[PDB]
Amino acid sequence: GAMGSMERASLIQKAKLAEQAERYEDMAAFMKGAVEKGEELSCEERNLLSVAYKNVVGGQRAAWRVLSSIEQKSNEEGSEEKGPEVREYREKVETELQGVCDTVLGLLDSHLIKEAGDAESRVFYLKMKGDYYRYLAEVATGDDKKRIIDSARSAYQEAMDISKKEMPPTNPIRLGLALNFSVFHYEIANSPEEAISLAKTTFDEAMADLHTLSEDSYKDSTLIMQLLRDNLTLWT
């Protein structure tokens, strides 16, 4: 690995600089290097890792959707034949996206998840595993599509089970997991009723626990609760 010669602390420092510079590819590479040092990550370091890859893959997904839409329109009736280029370039972006997903899943499997014993760390990594299988599912069309979908579901479900046992209903990690698993149900699993039920129940159980929180914790939890409400509004 090209980051093998750099100090762990320097990689983390540079990840923070890259974030400030909106250099998310660099940020991700620095954080990959840091993970590969083999030590567990702190809370802050998990945030940096997840922010970096979310931004990289987010850009790739947005691009893939633009290209997929153009490709779909090219395959309608009355559309002029423009040759293989749109498919080829969509495939190029797709392959790059799959590569990033495989990289993140690789870090989780080797060996972040197996060393994560605290609820916060284990739920966070399992949520990430669900997310990156979900992104693979978004672009999947082959023999393995059902297995990819099931891999996302399984990771999210394990995270949910731990979160419900070990974390309060307002915990931002528990909330963010539920938000994303709800989207999985709606967009990937063709289960809009499950998506809506999950978002509603999550929101309501969080609402009832807000009274226990400080002002700062209240702000953190309510931000994510608003996202749940936003999705419910979109879906109902």
Add this chain to the structure above:
Amino acid sequence: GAMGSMERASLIQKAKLAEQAERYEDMAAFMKGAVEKGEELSCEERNLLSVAYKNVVGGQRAAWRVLSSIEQKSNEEGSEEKGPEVREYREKVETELQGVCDTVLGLLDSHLIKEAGDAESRVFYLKMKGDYYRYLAEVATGDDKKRIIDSARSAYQEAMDISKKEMPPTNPIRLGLALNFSVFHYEIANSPEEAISLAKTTFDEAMADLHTLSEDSYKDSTLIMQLLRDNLTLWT
């Protein structure tokens, strides 16, 4: 070159797709491939080339400025020593930026400029040459800084001389050249009076020629004239 096996027309098609997807690195690579086919570029193709590299280098410049500011603050009195990381990462971004500039200058020198005989094409390429030497000048601190500045000046001056002889004062290429050479004077050559004079004279001579234009040409020219006015407002 990795684009050597792809059809010129397919490279251009994919550059347009990349633009739609906001994939400017890809766009630039496609356009580099197209240039390297060795045929002259059309007007549309010059636009694609310049848009791609402007966006790539623009992002790098923005990042470099963020990092340079952090580095400058680290070197003030009372700032805690954080080690070599900020300098190293600024240098990394800097080296990447210089690489892109060298790539564009390379395309211009081999062999876009020498084959460009029409005023529009030759002025456009010479303006680009000035621009990419200007970006090199922004980050230069060594023995060659004056030569880099003079290379930008020389390219801009040749473009100006041709533009004044061969193009009307409202021609968007003539206007955009003047806008950028004015910024060169203000930001690079420490010549704010020359910058202001150029912007004003350009604006006023354009104003007086607008009467000759169609509605669509009027829109194109006035857009750039407003940029000249914006800079004059910033500077006076």
Add this chain to the structure above:
Amino acid sequence: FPATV
């Protein structure tokens, strides 16, 4: 697109 974090 729906919100995710």
Add this chain to the structure above:
Amino acid sequence: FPATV
């Protein structure tokens, strides 16, 4: 920063 095109 000033405008350039």
